[PDB]
Write a sequence for this structure.
């Protein structure tokens, strides 16, 4: 099943959205 | 319907307004399905993604780290710091979600295996005259359902009529009655009666042990006896595999040693607590070196290794189902790659069960005591009525032979089966037993009365010539088959009459063993003459030659009783008088039929050879034919000698036991055996410590299927035989068994390469953090940096490992040893050797910038060991620039990079990269880049590197990370090399 490639892509998304929030937390606390 | 068991039988039909003769109409079904719902229990489905991440944050270590982080921030408030506790949480929340999706997909997949075989029941409904086999969840109250031996009862059912002499049921799972009980059809007057006293009900989830019966469905769904019970609880077996424990124990062991080393890193600093961290107030000094200690703890304590076993399973069992191997017992997947002997049945597993009568003979001349035979062949080997009866390879018209006319009359009336045209697949399909439907097609092909079939349609053509024979003789009853005589017969009377209860015949068909002794006459055309010695011997001799040569045909002897007894003088309750009913017979002819080998069996048996797996045919043909079949499919050689490698079950029963145990060691063909013999064989094989997979399909296969190491049930088989089993073959194919065994081996190697990756990655983490303290170095990695790396690897390269290919040359090896330890003593060396390198390198990278780096501080062989306060100026005449982001961004770099390299190393267990290249798994290559694009992301963005404490790396720096990292592929390649040749791995 190509459900396997979706599994890996969705994993990469989370640790991207995680890194994103920290870019959002840096500016936010800064000002 | 309430207290059906107390209502009489007319009353149950009446209550639901249903006919026994037809069943529910389509409308009634809709109404009753609207009203009573499906024959199911409600899908519980109680869990949530929200809840599970919270439930992950309930273990102590994760809370402690969060506490350490909070305290550290509050204390040093006096004069990030604060972002650290927040990013720790986020990464821990990130890792958690990934881990939850991981766990749940695996669970759902495993659970999904049940979809490959839905519970089914047999009903009669009005839109089709025949029995219908529907999904059991579509069975409604008032349905007329049918059950027979081997079935798993689909709903709570009032019994209407017992077609056997006895219906006999296994309701142990319900009433606890371990023995089988009998049922009747009269009512049980007491409404309040207890299950065990409702001798007129068949409850759901229950097996039939003997018999056939028809009943009306009284209640389905939760309303059933078992529904009431299943609704309370689960009642979940709840794991775990035996290997899961052996590896769990190793998890405990390792986890302990990591705890010790985690406390020990704290005490290396316990003298350093008052050095400026800063300026060395004891509580601040303590909690700092305690975030480190517990960070390494949370990130390196492994982890959910049973999670790994329950993932390779989920992957592999999915694969096996897509290849027609439906796994019922998950434990068996481990012991499956250990299979060393496969006993298989012949009919429909090594062969295909597509029968076709393709030679036949009748008597020709009879002079004194000798006889000529009239002997024909027939073309076309599907069920399609397309082909010709040849004689001397010349087409001929079969009705010109009165002998052939009667032989065809017999094949039409001693038959409980039929042909049906499948307008969607566009093919002629069978209804009933293959061996019978082969007689049906032969009567179609013969066409002894020359009725006009060329102009009919496929559908009506399908039974045209058979119907003409029935229009000629009325079948009144059937004398069902029995072993005592090896035949069956039908009592027929002539078409037209006016009492007139006379003129009758019996048509008898069976095996020559049974039939021939009972023939006093021989039919020559339409005349008859006394059967005699040399005639008997002549018939037998031809049946033999057909058996032992080329197509190896099982033969039926067809006869007629020209003066049967009166209808008034026969009784059908006891099967044992039928052999005397069928005496004074007149021989007619013989049909010989073909049952072609599977197309892939011959090549499959060769794969078992290459993989050291013995294969044992268990067939029911006489011995001679059996051996001919073994040669054809490659069990034996064209001219191999086997007078000691193939046994009749009777021959086998005369060997002393000492020598039966012996025979089982060399035998590859057992013919004409008892069901007792299946267990006998498994017992003997067991005594040589052989891992045996036995096939089976009938209720009587249940004991041996349980007793085998791996019981393998036929999907076309009985529910009873499948519960006994660890696997069901969807397509009944032998080749499916071998593909199952291969995947067994594949999964095991995938387990082995999963954990080799987890352990070595965790060990390195432990090492670097240890060296950095034990040698007196600056921290190569901040706690925050660790959990990051650990997040990326578990999310991308670790997952990507699930999508590896089967290892190479996986079945040019012999069966794994049972009890061969999961982690070899030698293997543990690699886990350490590779792991050490990681840690050695990652700190060897931080140590390098601190010494030989041109843009770094020259500290060549100088104590970086020197205490971090260092303002004394005794060796520096600078001064505390040791907190640089540069050393860590080689440590973090080499670590992240090695983790990718050591992931390429996890493509095979022993096989090199020059044989299984990096590109054998692209998803892995994909994930590495995806990882690498994040490391390059948190490096350069500018807001984030301040939180992760990192600095950019020029092309001067990333270069060294190759020289440092890459040899981990060198090292493992060396290790793997020593394996492949020296280790015999
Ligand atoms: K078993
Ligand atoms: Mg961890
Ligand atoms: Mg069979
Ligand atoms: Mg990890």
């Amino acid at each position: 099943m190509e459900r396997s490639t979706r599994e890996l892509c969705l994993n990469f998304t989370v640790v991207l959205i995680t890194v994103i929030l920290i870019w959002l937390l840096v500016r936010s606390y800064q000002y | 319907m309430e207290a059906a068991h107390s209502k009489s039988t007319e009353e149950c039909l009446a209550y639901f307004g249903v006919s026994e003769t037809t069943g529910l109409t389509p409308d009634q079904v809709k109404r009753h399905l609207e009203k009573y719902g499906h024959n199911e229990l409600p899908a519980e489905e109680g869990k949530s993604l929200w809840e599970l991440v919270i439930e992950q944050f309930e273990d102590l270590l994760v809370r402690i780290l969060l506490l350490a982080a909070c305290i550290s921030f509050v204390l040093a408030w006096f004069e990030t710091a604060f972002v650290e506790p927040f990013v720790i949480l986020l990464i821990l929340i990130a890792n958690a979600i990934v881990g939850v999706w991981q766990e749940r997909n695996a669970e759902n997949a495993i659970e999904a295996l049940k979809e490959y075989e839905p519970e089914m029941g047999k009903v009669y409904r009005a839109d089709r005259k025949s029995v219908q086999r529907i999904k059991a969840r579509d069975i409604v109250p008032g349905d007329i359902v049918e059950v027979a031996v081997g079935d798993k009862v689909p709903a709570d059912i009032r019994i209407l009529s017992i077609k056997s002499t006895t219906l006999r049921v296994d309701q142990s799972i319900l009433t606890g009655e371990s023995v089988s009980v009998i049922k009747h059809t009269e009512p049980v007057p007491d409404p309040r009666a207890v299950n065990q006293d409702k001798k007129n009900m068949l409850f759901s989830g229950t097996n039939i042990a003997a018999g056939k019966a028809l009943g009306i469905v009284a209640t389905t769904g939760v309303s059933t006896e078992i529904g009431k019970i299943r609704d309370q609880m689960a009642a979940t077996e709840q794991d775990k595999t035996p290997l899961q424990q052996k590896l769990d124990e190793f998890g405990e062991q390792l986890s302990k040693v990591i705890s010790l080393i985690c406390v020990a890193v704290w005490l290396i600093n316990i003298g350093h607590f008052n050095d400026p961290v800063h300026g060395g107030s004891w509580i601040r000094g303590a909690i700092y070196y305690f975030k480190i200690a517990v960070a390494l703890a949370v990130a390196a304590i492994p982890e959910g290794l049973p999670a790994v076993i329950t993932t390779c399973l989920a992957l592999g069992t999915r694969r096996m189902a897509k290849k027609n191997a439906i796994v019922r017992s998950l434990p068996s997947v481990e012991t499956l790659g250990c299979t060393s002997v496969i006993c298989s049945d012949k009919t429909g597993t090594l062969t295909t069960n597509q029968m076709s009568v393709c030679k036949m003979f009748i008597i020709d001349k009879v002079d004194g005591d000798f006889c000529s035979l009239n002997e024909f062949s027939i073309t076309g080997s599907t069920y399609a009525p397309e082909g010709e009866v040849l004689k001397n390879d010349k087409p001929i018209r079969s009705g010109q032979f009165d002998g052939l006319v009667e032989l065809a009359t017999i094949c039409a009336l001693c038959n409980d089966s039929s042909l049906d045209f499948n307008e969607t697949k566009g093919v002629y399909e069978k209804v009933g037993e293959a061996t019978e439907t082969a007689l049906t097609t032969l009567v179609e092909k013969m066409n002894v009365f020359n009725t006009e079939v060329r102009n009919l349609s496929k559908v009506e053509r399908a039974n045209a010539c058979n119907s003409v024979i029935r229009q000629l003789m009325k079948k009144e009853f059937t004398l069902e088959f029995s072993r005592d005589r090896k035949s069956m017969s039908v009592y027929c009377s002539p078409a037209k009459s006016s009492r007139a209860a006379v003129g009758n015949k019996m048509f008898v068909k069976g095996a020559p063993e049974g039939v021939i002794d009972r023939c006093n006459y021989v039919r020559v055309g339409t005349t008859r003459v006394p059967m005699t010695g040399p005639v008997k011997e002549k018939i037998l001799s031809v049946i033999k030659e057909w058996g032992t040569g080329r197509d190896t045909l099982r033969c039926l002897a067809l006869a007629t009783r020209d003066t049967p007894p009166k209808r008034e003088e026969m009784v059908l309750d006891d099967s044992s008088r039928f052999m005397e009913y069928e005496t004074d017979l007149t021989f007619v002819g013989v049909v010989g039929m073909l049952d072609p080998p599977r197309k892939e069996v011959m090549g499959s048996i060769q794969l078992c050879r290459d993989a050291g797996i013995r294969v044992i045919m268990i067939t029911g043909d006489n011995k001679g034919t059996a051996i001919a079949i073994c040669r054809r499919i490659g069990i034996f050689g064209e001219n191999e000698e086997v007078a000691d490698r193939a046994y009749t079950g009777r021959e086998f029963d005369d060997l002393p036991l000492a020598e039966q145990r012996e025979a089982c060691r060399r035998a590859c063909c057992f013919a004409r055996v008892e069901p007792s013999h299946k267990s006998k064989i498994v017992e003997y094989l067991q005594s040589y410590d052989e891992i045996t997979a036995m096939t089976g399909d009938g209720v009587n296969d249940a004991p041996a299927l349980k007793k085998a190491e791996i019981g393998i049930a036929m999907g076309s088989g009985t529910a009873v035989a499948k519960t006994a089993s660890e696997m069901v073959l969807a397509d009944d194919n032998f080749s499916t068994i071998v593909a199952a065994v291969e995947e067994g081996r594949a999964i095991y190697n995938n387990m082995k390469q999963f954990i080799r990756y987890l352990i070595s990655s965790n060990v390195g983490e432990v090492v670097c953090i240890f060296l950095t303290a034990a040698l007196g170095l600056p921290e190569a990695l901040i706690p925050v940096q660790l959990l990051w790396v650990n997040l990326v690897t578990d999310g991308l390269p670790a997952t990507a490992l699930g999508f590896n290919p089967p290892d190479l040359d996986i079945m040019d090896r012999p069966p794994r040893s049972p009890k061969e330890p999961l982690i070899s003593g030698w293997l543990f060396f690699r886990y350490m050797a590779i792991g050490g390198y990681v840690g050695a390198a990652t700190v060897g990278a931080a140590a390098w910038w601190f010494m030989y780096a041109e843009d770094g501080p020259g500290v060549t062989y100088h104590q970086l060991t020197h205490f971090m306060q260092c303002t004394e100026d005794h060796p520096h005449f600078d001064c505390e620039i040791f907190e640089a982001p540069e050393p860590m961004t080689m440590a973090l770099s080499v670590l992240v990079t090695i983790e990718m390299c050591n992931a390429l190393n996890s493509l095979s267990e022993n096989q090199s990269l020059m044989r299984m290249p990096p590109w054998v798994n692209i998803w892995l290559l994909g994930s590495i880049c995806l990882s690498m694009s994040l490391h390059f992301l948190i490096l350069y963005v500018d807001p984030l590197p301040m939180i992760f404490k990192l600095k950019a790396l020029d092309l001067t720096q990333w270069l060294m990370v190759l020289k440092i990292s890459l040899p981990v592929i060198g090292l493992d390649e060396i290790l793997k090399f020593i394996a492949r040749n020296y280790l015999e791995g």
